[PDB]
Design a protein around this ligand. Sequence first.
Ligand SMILES: Nc1ncnc2c1ncn2[C@@H]1O[C@H](COP(=O)(O)CP(=O)(O)OP(=O)(O)O)[C@@H](O)[C@H]1O
Ligand SMILES: [Mg+2]
Ligand SMILES: [Mg+2]
Ligand SMILES: [Mg+2]
Ligand SMILES: [Mg+2]
Ligand SMILES: [Mg+2]
Ligand SMILES: [Mg+2]
Ligand SMILES: [Mg+2]
Ligand SMILES: [Mg+2]
Lengths: 120, 120, 119, 119
Amino acid sequence: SMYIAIDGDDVGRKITSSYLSNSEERLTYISNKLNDTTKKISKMLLSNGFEIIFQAADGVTAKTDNEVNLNFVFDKIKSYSFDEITFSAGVGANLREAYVALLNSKSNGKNMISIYKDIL
Amino acid sequence: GSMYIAIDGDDVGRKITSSYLSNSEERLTYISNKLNDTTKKISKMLLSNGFEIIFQAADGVTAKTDNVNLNFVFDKIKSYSFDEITFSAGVGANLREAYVALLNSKSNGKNMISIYKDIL
Amino acid sequence: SMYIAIDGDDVGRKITSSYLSNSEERLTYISNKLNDTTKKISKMLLSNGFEIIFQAADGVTAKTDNVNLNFVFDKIKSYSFDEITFSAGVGANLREAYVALLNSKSNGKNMISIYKDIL
Amino acid sequence: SMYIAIDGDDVGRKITSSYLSNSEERLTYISNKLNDTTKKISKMLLSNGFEIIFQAADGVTAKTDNEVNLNFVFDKIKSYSFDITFSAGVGANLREAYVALLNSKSNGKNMISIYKDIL
Ligand SMILES: Nc1ncnc2c1ncn2[C@@H]1O[C@H](COP(=O)(O)CP(=O)(O)OP(=O)(O)O)[C@@H](O)[C@H]1O
Ligand SMILES: [Mg+2]
Ligand SMILES: [Mg+2]
Ligand SMILES: [Mg+2]
Ligand SMILES: [Mg+2]
Ligand SMILES: [Mg+2]
Ligand SMILES: [Mg+2]
Ligand SMILES: [Mg+2]
Ligand SMILES: [Mg+2]
């Protein structure tokens, strides 16, 4: 079993910027683009034998017992970024390891994938 | 004029992180689904009271109206609370004021609604 | 061999409240009291055979090769002031203690967690 | 009367990286180098007639009733960056300086914002 956790990089900053500048359009644009992006990632993971566990905000968590090419999967994730919003990912044997792996990515540059085993 | 309101869930990530660290896919997918259902009921209620939805993603909902009883709208929002998840609200004459009012509600306890003109 | 990661609960919220309300006195007190509390936490840990690895902000991270974890955290609970409490995480290395801290943060507040107990 | 709120940019990311990699050295270096940076920011604000209101964690908040050259003040803050930058907000009260700091934090950081210029 493989668990992967994906989350947008520094998304709250762009949302806070829209509020402070009183820009309904950019705030609405961001919200729509995020929802559309999380849909693409979720349907991409489904096409590669993943089971969607979580799909809300700017993150998507899925699992799978089939063989997967993380290089191809995360390559697709990076291809879904818009403006300067990237996505980080963490892989592990369970939910905890995937979450801890995601923390490692978002704390070492973001826009990257971290495999829990490679953190030890 | 146009009044704005920013609604956001209280300590939403803490329940989510707890699900990851405990390897509870049940509690995780539940929070994800119930969050999407709750924000849809919040916007639906807002549309029914003369509001225009500006943002409806993650655990928050932002809207504006040119027409409103805040105790009514906030009680409706607080009636949609599920499990240990409450909602805070911020109101102002623009997005910036509504945002700072939301920050006010989340810093002085939670499950409350603040009006920007009342913080000055 | 044993790492402990202590951190204050919801400190940024009480600081933000002082800003939005223009409460200089409360903000200064939070700064003073926070620095004194972390100092108290370190000396208490130094008295119990701990080596301080980290003492700044709203937390203290230390390790020990020798302890009364229950008594240690009980004084940590007592060091709370105003609306600010403290959580802690214990593990065999820095990663485990940190993950244990996040476990305490995500499961309430003013609680201590042991990494081997969350597995 | 002027208020200025200063806070380090993306400090927890380097602290989290230290925990997850079991690097007591990096965690110690970060904690020490930051405390030396805030005190350096504080001494610089003192020399310019500021009254320190808050000095804890990665933040430094002060006020002053004298005219100030913010460009020089902030350029000095940028000179204190190591490896880690600092953004700041200015205003006539704590609330305005805080909102100004939020503006700098969500518009690229490593910058200074004045409340009256954001409106
Ligand atoms: N000079 C400095 N030295 C050591 N740590 C510093 C520091 N400056 C900032 N830190 C960081 O300051 C932050 C303190 O607040 P945080 O713990 O992050 C959120 P909080 O509101 O205080 O409570 P929470 O952790 O329960 O959410 C820490 O993340 C710490 O990494
Ligand atoms: Mg994100
Ligand atoms: Mg997210
Ligand atoms: Mg929320
Ligand atoms: Mg939110
Ligand atoms: Mg804290
Ligand atoms: Mg802390
Ligand atoms: Mg900071
Ligand atoms: Mg800070």
